[PDB]
Structures are given as structure tokens and as C-alpha cells.
Amino acid sequence: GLLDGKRILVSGIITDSSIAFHIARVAQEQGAQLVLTGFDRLRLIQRITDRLPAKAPLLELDVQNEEHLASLAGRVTEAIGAGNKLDGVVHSIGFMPQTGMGINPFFDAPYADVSKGIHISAYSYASMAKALLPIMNPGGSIVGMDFDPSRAMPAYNWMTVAKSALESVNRFVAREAGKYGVRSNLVAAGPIRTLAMSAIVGGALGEEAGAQIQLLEEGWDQRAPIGWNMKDATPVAKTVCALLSDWLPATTGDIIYADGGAHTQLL
Amino acid sequence: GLLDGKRILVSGIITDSSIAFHIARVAQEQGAQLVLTGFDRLRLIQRITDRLPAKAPLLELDVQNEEHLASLAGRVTEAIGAGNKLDGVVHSIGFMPQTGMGINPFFDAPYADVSKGIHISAYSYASMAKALLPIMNPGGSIVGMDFDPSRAMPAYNWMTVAKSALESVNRFVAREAGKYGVRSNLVAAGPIRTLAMSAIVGGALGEEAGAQIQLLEEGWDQRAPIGWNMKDATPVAKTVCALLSDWLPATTGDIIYADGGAHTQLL
Amino acid sequence: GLLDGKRILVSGIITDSSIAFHIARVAQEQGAQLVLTGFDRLRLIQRITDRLPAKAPLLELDVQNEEHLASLAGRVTEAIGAGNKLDGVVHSIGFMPQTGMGINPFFDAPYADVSKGIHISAYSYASMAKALLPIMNPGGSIVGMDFDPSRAMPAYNWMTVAKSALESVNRFVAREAGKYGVRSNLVAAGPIRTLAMSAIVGGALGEEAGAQIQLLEEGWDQRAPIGWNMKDATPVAKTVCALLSDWLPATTGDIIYADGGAHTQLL
Amino acid sequence: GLLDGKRILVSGIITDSSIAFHIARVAQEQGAQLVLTGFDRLRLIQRITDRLPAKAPLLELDVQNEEHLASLAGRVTEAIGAGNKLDGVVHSIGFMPQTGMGINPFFDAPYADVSKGIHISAYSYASMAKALLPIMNPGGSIVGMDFDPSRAMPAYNWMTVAKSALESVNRFVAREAGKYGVRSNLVAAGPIRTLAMSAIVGGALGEEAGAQIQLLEEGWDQRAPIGWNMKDATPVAKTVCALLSDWLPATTGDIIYADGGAHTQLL
Ligand SMILES: NC(=O)c1ccc[n+]([C@@H]2O[C@H](COP(=O)([O-])OP(=O)(O)OC[C@H]3O[C@@H](n4cnc5c(N)ncnc54)[C@H](O)[C@@H]3O)[C@@H](O)[C@H]2O)c1
Ligand SMILES: NC(=O)c1ccc[n+]([C@@H]2O[C@H](COP(=O)([O-])OP(=O)(O)OC[C@H]3O[C@@H](n4cnc5c(N)ncnc54)[C@H](O)[C@@H]3O)[C@@H](O)[C@H]2O)c1
Ligand SMILES: NC(=O)c1ccc[n+]([C@@H]2O[C@H](COP(=O)([O-])OP(=O)(O)OC[C@H]3O[C@@H](n4cnc5c(N)ncnc54)[C@H](O)[C@@H]3O)[C@@H](O)[C@H]2O)c1
Ligand SMILES: NC(=O)c1ccc[n+]([C@@H]2O[C@H](COP(=O)([O-])OP(=O)(O)OC[C@H]3O[C@@H](n4cnc5c(N)ncnc54)[C@H](O)[C@@H]3O)[C@@H](O)[C@H]2O)c1
Ligand SMILES: CCOC(=O)[C@@H]1CCc2nc(C)sc2C1
Ligand SMILES: CCOC(=O)[C@@H]1CCc2nc(C)sc2C1
Ligand SMILES: CCOC(=O)[C@@H]1CCc2nc(C)sc2C1
Ligand SMILES: CCOC(=O)[C@@H]1CCc2nc(C)sc2C1
């Protein structure tokens, strides 16, 4: 398999529609040995991950919790066995309070809410790299999830701002990761119909925001020369596995677009 | 003059080497009527601004203070006279705690420090636009100060991340400002020898950081096809005035580079 | 005026809807003294330019003609008077054979046609700078016209490829122009309803191409935070004059977008 | 292997230091069945390719020859057997006359020379896709070789302009290739010490050009967070194979940077 013998940490599973669930599934189909991390609802996450092709230890990780971050490398080492290190790290963590996304005006998001969103969605990519680089092998790979923020768009609002910050954070993490012989890259995915996104498109954060995101999804598939299927995270999961593999060994501080090529076309 | 009859708010003056001091001077030489805003050291700022070509009211504005932001439009209206509105707004505000810039490792900046830096340097661009758009005239212009964050660089660290967030914020502010017939743009300046930058290059945030920034400054002038004079903020001030004028009326959500053309050249 | 006392060469006038006609008109309203250049239909161009606010000498220039290029500086000097040099140069020249634009498949444009289009639209920007830099003053400015080619789009086909080459050419021209204290920049305009574009939208190069360009124009105005009026070249002309002025003195090898901010927004 | 059972055409082998020689070697180590194409010196190319891990048919292809292009799909079909189609296409073709690269001034490259360089280096990417798309399988992949032309640089001159045109061509080829379920992407490699590049660095195109390219190579490795080894094309070859594989299935019209991450860092 593509990832035979690799030890990979995968964060971000919350439902069976999580992009990280599909990353974990594909990595296991490709021979990777995984360690999973989960936030807050660990009983739910264990029940979800019982459906993965192979059994994997699940560790708690709230990226806003400094104690969780400080003990993370020790907890991972205990799970993978002393003398073993990770070959890969997947950051598939993102959050923005409802005041920072949807119909709520861009100017009406309080800073405490924007700050929480940037902490979870951007700063934590550096927090995770800091915690895990001392237990990573040379030739290793750190991958985060991006949503192309080069241009503004309706409804995504402060989540787009957080993604612009994440892209910048990734370039600095690459400088640090390079000292360990480790790569740091992001996968910029097209929109995916996760449970939260289906709810948002359904109007959970206002009607106009749902209508605008539905138009964005349609335009994405129209612009993509190979099309874009929002109900299928497998092409995104495969791209993350390509970066975790030994097949992109000279790519770092960079962004790989798994978006059907939509960002390369205007119409 | 370029800005004859225009009413322009200028934030960010702290010393006679502040980029905003030169923006204010050039705007006044060009016939603009100014309102200045200052943070914390108002006695110092008044003494500095006494050296400007013309007298201008000075209002206190701490962008982290919600009360200052809530009363700002009323305080500006009182200063410019009832029935008058602003034609221009200059955001020349930036800050990052020393833990987020310099020799302190990128991974060692606590989030509370990064968050303060992003609040002042990025979020406040939206806070200022929210406060002042209701008192701006159609054809108006909002300008912020940028430092090209497209690629990572030594020492600038979390300030670069904050600038990536500011560029994203600017694109959203442009969407809101457009509803008022107002433009929103950033000027990406080359490095300027302000008092803080001279101190940093002198080793105030560690020797290695000072050495790296000095090399960056030299490389900037070398790459610039027209050269780059870090001791001269006047080309930057002129560029801000070009955006405040009626001469770039179809440019918004954008970045104008006043960097000697250095970002367009590799060597 | 913005361009008081400046001597500026303006190429590219063919009809009263030419972007260059509006650049010439605005530059004259702003106190510039012009020299015009025209291709092939000089009687027509003189009759058109008789409608400009002020009289201006008209010189023949076919950019594919090496003799025209070799004698150009001498012909300009004769027109402006010995001892006088140009302060500005406007390249507003573009062409692509019909095989390289429209419904004709992208793969069906013969190279001789693509090559002619790239010669006129991209290489000539360097040919014009080579011919005129020896007769340009320090502080001078060379401006070319761009159409954002960062992403592919229907119908524009090989014209987009030629614009990608022009943007690259501009960065090299800036290196050469800098030796003379001269800036080189492009203005990336939104779509303008010139006579040829109206004919194209009307189906002159096939129905599907006309339909696609009409959709592009509509989407442009929708995405522009300040809107985009394709029937008005004046905001584009003002932007060219801003670059010809002394108000963007630290910008070179660069692109200024006079597109209503449309390129900064996805939807 | 990564490319088990795939039928891949590889162009561009001229010496054992050709990037295409290493692409061909790695693709064969990964189970691909190859068809090679060669220009002008077919006896030399056969002797070179005798050193590849497996035997592969060699077909003549001068991309400037319309007859070679018109018969190419028929010649490939004869070599791979009737009823078989290609899964992959590698364009590793580049050329610029010496007037367009090196110490010869940028303004001194005659258009006939620039045009030949753009024909071979940019237009031929579309000519090759036109010829081979009718004999490509869905899920297929076309890959071309790029050298980051986003910023101008010394000595590369018109080769950089040709690469800017190639990047634009790639985005249009992706639109056409998508109709066949085929991806089109470029690999932007860091500088490689091929025979021609070693000769250029050695002063074959002037001393100053050699000195500048040597400085560019050094700066590349310095900026790369993981370093850059110009004497090793294997990381570039692996990246091309990643794009030829099924592991980047949602990436098209795009650029993957196999440059040690140097383009993501300023210093
Ligand atoms: N869904 C899309 O359209 C889309 C597109 C591009 C990128 N992405 C990105 O992909 C990633 C995965 O998101 P998803 O769409 O699969 O949604 P998701 O809800 O399935 O996953 C987001 C994850 O973030 C985790 N998380 C939130 N706060 C956390 C905290 N304090 N500590 C640790 N984990 C925390 C959640 O538990 C969840 O597992 C995110 O970075 C997201 O921004 C999503
Ligand atoms: N100096 C450079 O090399 C350089 C280069 C590019 C961009 N810039 C940007 O230009 C702008 C001006 O900075 P400068 O270099 O002139 O430095 P400066 O110190 O002269 O100005 C920064 C200003 O930010 C103000 N400020 C800080 N915290 C504030 C708060 N809470 N509320 C309100 N104002 C606050 C300070 O009072 C000061 O006036 C900043 O956005 C900076 O990032 C600087
Ligand atoms: N119209 C648009 O939508 C649009 C948008 C962005 C940029 N532009 C660019 O603006 C510029 C001006 O074009 P326009 O739209 O005003 O069209 P236009 O037809 O009015 O102008 C193009 C000019 O190119 C000249 N030209 C053609 N071949 C020439 C040659 N061999 N030598 C000298 N001159 C030659 C023509 O005579 C004409 O004056 C071009 O570079 C064009 O690509 C146009
Ligand atoms: N060497 C570098 O530093 C570097 C860096 C980035 C990209 N590249 C690109 O990689 C590709 C391969 O070049 P390389 O460096 O391996 O050099 P190379 O000389 O080994 O390969 C270039 C190939 O182009 C072929 N070619 C030239 N004219 C042709 C024609 N008319 N028809 C068909 N083939 C023709 C040559 O025969 C040769 O095989 C090129 O696109 C080049 O621009 C090179
Ligand atoms: C309203 C907040 O939504 C989220 O945070 C969800 C999880 C992260 C996420 N990232 C996106 C690009 S959309 C989204 C949806
Ligand atoms: C150490 C913190 O320094 C600052 O915040 C100063 C003011 C804002 C600023 N912006 C830059 C691009 S350097 C700098 C210097
Ligand atoms: C079919 C060829 O059309 C042209 O060459 C006209 C003049 C130049 C031009 N540039 C554009 C961006 S559209 C266009 C229209
Ligand atoms: C002087 C012309 O050199 C070439 O054409 C060689 C082959 C193609 C090539 N591409 C590069 C990015 S350098 C180079 C070197």
C-alpha cells in the first residue's frame, strides 16, 4: 500500500461524514498504522471509528487545552510503543462560532468569537506541530486542511480569514519542520457536504447564507474541469495520503488543491 | 492638490518616523483636511503632530476598546462639523508582542499574545471600517498598511501571520464598503526604519533577529528594480494618497505594492 | 492637473471606444502633452483623435515592423522637439487572430496565428520599452494594458495565454526600465465594450463564445464590490493616469487592477 | 508499484542528466509500461535509454513538425497495441535560443528566436495534449515541467516568459482534458544540474549569467526549508509519478512545486 509501515496521527473525526474519517479509512486501506485524536465527545468518536477498516487507539485532544498539548507526545508514544515515532500527522480541525459565519454581518462577529475560531483553525496547526515534531521521523509529513481563502466569498466570512492565517502559519511550520527532515503542507479541498455543511446549506445559519453556499457549491462543480462531487470526500482523502507518502518529497510550506481544478478557472 | 477638499481620518502616529506621520504630512501638502487618532500617549502624539504642515484635531482611539469604537463616529462628526462626512480613512496600526516577533521561537508565542497582535493588526481594520463607514461619503476610500506576507520570512513570525489575516479582512471589508460606494485597499510597503524597526535591527529582540532583518532590508533594495530606501517613507505616503484620491476609482479589496517592485523579482 | 507638464506617448487608438482614446482624453484633461502612435489606418485615427481635447502629433507604428521601431525615438524627438524627452509611455496594443479566440477550439489555433498574437500583445511591450527608454526621463512611467489571465476562461483562449506572457514580460521590462529611473506596470482592466468586444458579444466569433463572454461580463459586475460598468472606460483611463503620475513612485514590475475589485471576490 | 499497469508516454530524454530520464526510470521502477519520444538525435537517445530498468519503444517527435504530431497517436497505438490507450503523458520539453537566455540583453532577443522558444516550451504542451487525448483513458494524467516564473530573475529571461505562457496553456489544456476524464498539471522544479545547466553555470552563455544562476541555485537551497539538491532529479521524478498516479485525482489545471519549498520562503 501507499503508506505501508507508516505510523500516522489523525485528528478531526467527529462523524462518519468528517473529512478526517475518510482520510483515516484511506490511510488504513493503504497500510498505515494510525493513532486517532478526538475532541470532547470521545464516546461518540470511538463508536464512529469502530467502523474504520482497522482498530486504532483514540486519544483526547482539545487544541485549546495546554495540558492536552503538553502531554500529547507522551500519550502518543505510550500508544505506539517506546522507541517508535510518527511518520505522519493530519490536522483536520476547524471551527468558527456562528457569529463569524453565516448571515450574521461580517462586522458583527465579536473578537472573542473570531479569536476562538483562529485559535482552533489556525494557531493549533502550529501547536500540533510543536507537540509532535519531537516524536516525528525524518522523511515525515504534517498535513492540514485548507479552504481556498485567496478571494473573499459570501457567508464563510471569518472562517475564510482563519484559513488565510492557517496558510501563513503553514509556511512558518514548514521552516521548523524542515529542521526534523519533516514536510508541512495543506490540502485545499473543494466544499464537502459534512453534517454541519448540510445543516448550513439547509439554513441553520440563516436562509441567505444557505442559498449563497449552495450557489458556491454549484459554481465549484461548473468551474472544475473534472467536476466536483461535494458528497465524496474520497478524492480529498487520497490527496492527503499522497502528501503523507514518500511521493511528494520536495514539497513543503505549500498548498495542494484537491478541488477538481475549480480554483484554476474563472468560468 | 491631489486631495483638495477631502476630509481624511489618519490613525497610527506615535513618532516622527511613523509611516502615518508621513501619510498625514503628504495628505496635508495635497490639500486634505485631517482628523487624527492616537493610542495611549496623547500628550506625546499632540507634540509630534504640532510639526505637521497644518493643525488637526486629535481623538483618542484604542482599537481594543469597544467604547472608543462605539463613540468614534460621533467624536469625528463633532470634530469635522455636523453634516460633514469623511472622504478617507487611514488605518496605520500594527502590533505584535515580543513573544511573536524576533528570536523567540515561532512555536513559543503564547496564543494570548498572538491574539492581541491579530486583534490590533487585522481585526481592527474591520472594527475601524464598521465605526466609520456610516459617516463616509460615496467615492470614499479606506486604506490599511500591509507587509507582504505571501511567503514566510525570518523574525517577522506572527506579525506575518497577522498580515495574512489583514489581507483576508480587507477583501471582506471591501464587500461592506462597496454598499456605501467606498473602496477598501491595503498598501504593502517595503521595510521602513521607524524607531521600533531601528531598535529591532539594533538587536532589541535578539541579535540573530536583527541580523536577519538587516539582510532582508539589503535584499529588498537589491531586488527592487528602482531600489528601496528604508529611511524614506515618502514614496509609501504618496501611494496611500493615490488610493485616497479619485485616481484609482475601480480598485477595491486589493493590495498596491509600494516596495520598489521588490516582490516582482526573485534576485 | 495630475499630469501637468508631462510628455506622454499614447499608442492603441483605433476607434472612439478604444481604451487608449479615453486614456489620451483623461491625460490631456490632466495637463499632459501627448504624442500618439497609430497602426495601419492613419487617416481614420487622425479623424478620431481630432475629437480629443487637444491637438497631438500622430506617428505611424506597426509593432511588427522593425524599421518603425528603429526610427521611433527619432520620430518622437522630432515631434516633441530636440532636448525634450518623454515622461510617460502607454502601450494599449492587443491582437489575436480569430483562430485563437472565440468558438474555434483552443487546440485548433495554428502556431503562426498564436505567434502573431503573442508578438503584438506581449513581445511588443518589450519592443516599445527598448525603443523609447533612451528618450525617457528619470521618474518616468511605462504602462501596458492587461486582462487578468491568472485563471483560464471560455472564449478568450490564446489572448489569455498572450496576457500571461505580457505579465511576465512586464517584470523583465521593469528590470531594464529601472536603470533609467523608469517604472513599468500594467493595468488589468475589467471587460470593456469596445467596438470589437460588442461585435464578439454579438456573435462575430460564434454564438457560444458571445454567450460565454456576456456571462463573464455579468459575473464581473456581480463580483465587483463597487460594481463594473463595461460601457465606461473612464475608471480604467484614470488608473493609467495614476501610474503615469508621480503618485505611485515605488511601484514597478507590477499590476494594478482597475476591475471594480472583481478579482478579489469569488462570488 | 505506484504506477502498476499504467501505459505512459515520456518525452524529453536527451542525456542521462535529463529530468525525463529520471522520470522514466522512476515510473518503470513503479511498474509503468512506457513509450518514449525523442527529438532529432534518435541514435543517441536509444543508447541513453538502453540504461533504463526496462526496454521501451522509442518514437521520433519534433513538436515543431506538424506531420510528427498528426501521426503520433497512430504510432503510439502501433507501439502499445490496438485496443490499448495511454494512462499518462509526460511533456519534459523546453528550449530557448541563446539570444533569449544568458548575458544577451533581454531587449536583444529577436522575435523569431523568442517565438521558436515559446512554440517548443509552451504551445507544444497543447499540441501534445491535442495529439494524445483521443488515445487516453479516463482517470488519465498529462504532466508538464515548469520553472516558477511568478517573479522575474536574471539570465533566464525569455525562458521565464515561455514558462509564464506554459502555466496559462496548462489551465486551458485542463479544460479540454477534463472532457476525456483526464487531468493536466505542471511540476515546478527547483534548478537541476543537467548537462546544459552545468555548461550555463560554467559560463557557456556568458560569465555574468553563469555567476547569477549559481547565486540563484545557492539561494534556492538556503530558502528551501528541506534544502534543495540541484544534482538530484529523483525528488522531481517522484513528484511527476505522484501526478501520474491515482493519488491526486481532484487536481487539474494546477502546479505542484517540487522545489524544496523554496518558493514559500523569502529568506
Ligand atoms: N467541509 C468543507 O466543506 C471543508 C472544505 C475545506 C476544508 N475543510 C476543513 O477540513 C477540516 C475538517 O473539517 P470537516 O469539514 O471534516 O468538519 P468536521 O466537523 O467533521 O471536523 C472538524 C473537526 O474539528 C474538531 N475540533 C473543533 N474544535 C476542536 C478543538 N478545540 N480541539 C480539537 N478538535 C477540535 C471537531 O471535533 C471536528 O472533529 C477543517 O479544517 C475544515 O475547515 C472543510
Ligand atoms: N515599519 C515597517 O517596516 C512596515 C512595513 C510595512 C507595513 N508596516 C505597517 O505600517 C503600519 C504603521 O506602522 P509603523 O511601522 O509606522 O510603526 P509605528 O509604531 O510608527 O505605528 C504603529 C501604530 O500602531 C498604533 N497602535 C498600537 N496598538 C494600538 C491600539 N491598541 N489602538 C490603536 N493604535 C494602536 C501605535 O500607537 C502606532 O501609532 C502598521 O500596520 C505596520 O504593520 C510597517
Ligand atoms: N476591451 C477589453 O475588454 C479589454 C480588457 C482588458 C484589457 N484590454 C487591453 O487593452 C488594450 C487596448 O485594447 P482595446 O480593448 O481598447 O481595443 P482596440 O481595438 O480599441 O485597441 C487595440 C489596439 O491594438 C492596435 N494594434 C493591433 N495590431 C497592432 C500592431 N501590429 N501595431 C500596433 N498597434 C497594433 C490596434 O490598432 C488598436 O488600436 C489591449 O492591450 C487589450 O488587450 C482590453
Ligand atoms: N534543468 C532545470 O533547471 C529545470 C528546472 C525546471 C524545469 N525544467 C524543465 O524541465 C524540462 C526538461 O528539461 P531538462 O532540464 O531535463 O533539459 P533537457 O535538455 O535534458 O531536456 C529538454 C528536452 O527538450 C527536447 N526538445 C527540444 N526541442 C524539441 C523539439 N522541437 N521537439 C521535441 N523535443 C524537443 C530536447 O530534445 C530535450 O530532450 C523542460 O521543460 C525544462 O524547461 C528544467
Ligand atoms: C459554523 C462553523 O462551522 C464550522 O466550523 C464547520 C467545521 C469547519 C469548517 N470549515 C469549513 C471550510 S466550513 C466548516 C463547517
Ligand atoms: C515587536 C513588535 O513590533 C511592532 O509591532 C512594530 C510596529 C508594527 C510593525 N509592523 C511591521 C510590518 S514591523 C512592525 C514593528
Ligand atoms: C479576436 C481578437 O480580438 C482582439 O484582439 C480585440 C483587441 C484586443 C483585445 N484584448 C482583450 C482582452 S479582448 C480584445 C479584443
Ligand atoms: C539556453 C537554452 O537552454 C535550454 O533551453 C535548456 C533546456 C530547457 C531549460 N529549461 C529551463 C528552466 S533551464 C533550461 C536549459
Residue type (1 letter), C154: P
**Separation CA A185–CA C192 (nearest Å):** 40
**Separation CA D260–CA D225 (nearest Å):** 7
Q: How many helices (H) and strands (E) does chain D have?
A: 9, 7
Give the side-chain half-sphere CA count within 13 A for B249: 15
A152 CA → ligand 7 middle, Å: 29
* Rg of chain A (C-alpha set): 18
Look at A152 and C215 and tell me if their CB atoms are within 8 Å.
no
B267 shares contact with chain D (CB less than 8 Å)? yes
A65 shares contact with chain B (CB less than 8 Å)? no
Residues of B with CB below 8 A from A118's CB? 115, 118, 165
A46 min Cα distance to partner chain B (Å): 30
Look at A261 and D254 and tell me if their CB atoms are within 8 Å.
yes
Residues of C with CB below 8 A from A164's CB? none
What 3 state SS string does C226-251 have? CCCCCCCCHHHHHHHHHHHCCCCCCC
A2 min Cα distance to partner chain D (Å): 8
Partners of residue C185 on adjacent β-strands: C143, C254
Cell of B3: 486631495
Asked if C86 and C80 count as a contact pair (C-beta separation under 8 A), the reply is yes
**Separation CA C70–CA C130 (nearest Å):** 10
Of D126, D161, D253, the CB nearest to C106: D126
Asked if A156 and A181 count as a contact pair (C-beta separation under 8 A), the reply is no
Cell of C113: 496565428
- The torsion defined by the Cα of D163, D168, D174 and D176, in degrees rounded to 10, comes to -120
**Partner chains of A (3+ C-beta pairs under 8 Å):** B, C, D
Residues of D with CB below 8 A from C129's CB? 107
Asked if C41 and C14 count as a contact pair (C-beta separation under 8 A), the reply is yes
**Separation CA B151–CA B153 (nearest Å):** 7
C58-60 vs C86-91, strand pairing mode? unpaired
Closest to C220 in 3D by CA, of A41, B250, D77, D92: B250
B119 → chain A, closest CA residue? A111
Ligand 5 pocket residues where CB is under 6 Å: A 94-96, 98, 101, 147, 159, 196-197
Cell of B155: 523574525
CB of A157 sitting under 6 A from ligand 1: no
Nearest CA to ligand 7 atom 1: C98
Closest to B89 in 3D by CA, of B119, B61, B51, B54: B61
Asked if A59 and A79 count as a contact pair (C-beta separation under 8 A), the reply is yes
Per-residue burial over D185-213, b = 16 or more CB atoms within 10 Å of its CB, e = otherwise: bbbbbbbbbbebbeebbebebbeebbebb
Q: Which residues 6+ apart lie within 8 Å of D195 measured at CB?
A: D15, D17
Cβ atoms < 10 Å from Cβ of A260: 28
Asked if D34 and D15 count as a contact pair (C-beta separation under 8 A), the reply is no
Ligand 8 pocket residues where CB is under 6 Å: D 94-96, 98, 101, 147, 159, 196-197
Residue with cell 535509454: D49
C214 → chain A, closest CA residue? A267
A113 shares contact with chain D (CB less than 8 Å)? no
Q: Which residues 6+ apart lie within 8 Å of D32 measured at CB?
A: D1, D3, D4, D6, D7, D8, D88, D241, D244
**Separation CA C75–CA C36 (nearest Å):** 11
**Separation CA C6–CA C140 (nearest Å):** 9
CB of A92 sitting under 6 A from ligand 1: yes
**Separation CA C92–CA B73 (nearest Å):** 44
| Cα diameter, chain A | 54
Nearest CA to ligand 6 atom 13: B197
Length of chain A, in residues = 267
Which structural domain, as residue segments, surrounds residue A121? 1-267
Residue with cell 494510525: A34
What are the CB-based long-range contacts (under 8 Å, 24+) for C202-210?
C204/C102, C205/C98, C205/C101, C205/C102, C205/C103, C205/C104, C205/C155, C206/C102, C206/C103, C206/C104, C207/C103, C208/C103, C208/C155, C209/C101, C209/C102, C209/C103, C209/C154, C209/C155
D50 min Cα distance to partner chain C (Å): 34
**Separation CA B242–CA C244 (nearest Å):** 12
Look at D257 and A265 and tell me if their CB atoms are within 8 Å.
no
Of C175, C254, C260, the CB nearest to B250: C260
Q: Which residues 6+ apart lie within 8 Å of D115 measured at CB?
A: C115, C118, C119
**Separation CA D133–CA B53 (nearest Å):** 68
Output the domain CATH number for residue D190.
Answer: 3.40.50.720
Q: Is C18 left (phi over 0), alpha (psi -120 to 50) or beta?
A: beta
CB of B64 sitting under 6 A from ligand 6: no
Residues of D with CB below 8 A from B153's CB? 265-267
Per-residue burial over C64-73, b = 16 or more CB atoms within 10 Å of its CB, e = otherwise: eeeebbebbb
**Separation CA C104–CA C62 (nearest Å):** 27
A58-60 vs A33-38, strand pairing mode? parallel
Check whether D163 is labelled as a binding-site residue.
Answer: yes
How many domains, in total, are found in chain B?
A: 1
Asked if C227 and B252 count as a contact pair (C-beta separation under 8 A), the reply is no
- The torsion defined by the Cα of D254, D260, D261 and D262, in degrees rounded to 10, comes to -110
Residues of C with CB below 8 A from A151's CB? 263-266
D133 min Cα distance to partner chain A (Å): 14
Look at B265 and D212 and tell me if their CB atoms are within 8 Å.
no
Cell of D66: 506538424
Which DSSP helix (H) or strand (E) runs through D210? helix D207-223
Of B154, B216, B264, the CB nearest to D152: B264
Query: Binding site residues of B for substrate, as ranges?
Result: 156
Look at B168 and A172 and tell me if their CB atoms are within 8 Å.
no
Atom number of ligand 1 nearest to Cα A146: 7
- The torsion defined by the Cα of C5, C11, C16 and C19, in degrees rounded to 10, comes to -90
CB of A30 sitting under 6 A from ligand 1: no
Look at C219 and A267 and tell me if their CB atoms are within 8 Å.
yes
Method used to determine the 3D structure? X-ray
CB of B98 sitting under 6 A from ligand 6: yes
**Could you say which ligand is closest to the alpha carbon of residue A195?**
1
Cα end-to-end span (Å), chain D: 38
**Separation CA D104–CA D116 (nearest Å):** 17
What 3 state SS string does chain C have? CCCCCCEEEECCCCCCCCHHHHHHHHHHHCCCEEEEEECCCHHHHHHHHCCCCCCCCEEECCCCCHHHHHHHHHHHHHHHCCCCCEEEEEECCCCCCHHHCCCCCHHHCCHHHHHHHHHHHHHHHHHHHHHHHHHEEEEEEEEEEECCCCCECCCCHHHHHHHHHHHHHHHHHHHHHHCCCCEEEEEEECCCCCHHHHHHHCCCCCHHHHHHHHHHHHHHHHHCCCCCCCCCCHHHHHHHHHHHCCCCCCCCCEEEEECCCHHHECC
Closest to C87 in 3D by CA, of C100, C76, C103: C76
D265 shares contact with chain C (CB less than 8 Å)? no
C174 CA → ligand 6 middle, Å: 30
Residues of B with CB below 8 A from C251's CB? 239, 256-259, 261
**Strand, helix or coil at A77?**
helix
C19 min Cα distance to partner chain A (Å): 23
What ranges make up the beta strands (E) of chain A? 7-10, 33-38, 58-60, 86-91, 136-146, 183-189, 254-258
Helix C157-178 × helix C124-132 angle, to 10°: 20
Check whether D93 is labelled as a binding-site residue.
Answer: yes
B267 shares contact with chain C (CB less than 8 Å)? no
B159 CA → ligand 6 middle, Å: 7
DSSP-derived secondary structure letter, A156: T
C156 CA → ligand 7 middle, Å: 8
Residue type (1 letter), B57: P
C151 → chain D, closest CA residue? D171
Cβ atoms < 10 Å from Cβ of A130: 19
- What number of C-beta contacts closer than 8 Å exist between A and B? 80
**Separation CA B50–CA C54 (nearest Å):** 44
Cβ atoms < 10 Å from Cβ of A170: 29
Residue type (1 letter), C233: A
C259 shares contact with chain B (CB less than 8 Å)? yes
Judge residue C74's burial from the number of C-beta atoms within 10 Å of its C-beta, 0-12 exposed, 13-18 middle, 19 or more buried.
exposed
Look at C164 and D160 and tell me if their CB atoms are within 8 Å.
no
Ligand 7 pocket residues where CB is under 6 Å: C 94-96, 98, 101, 147, 159, 196-197
**Separation CA D160–CA D148 (nearest Å):** 8
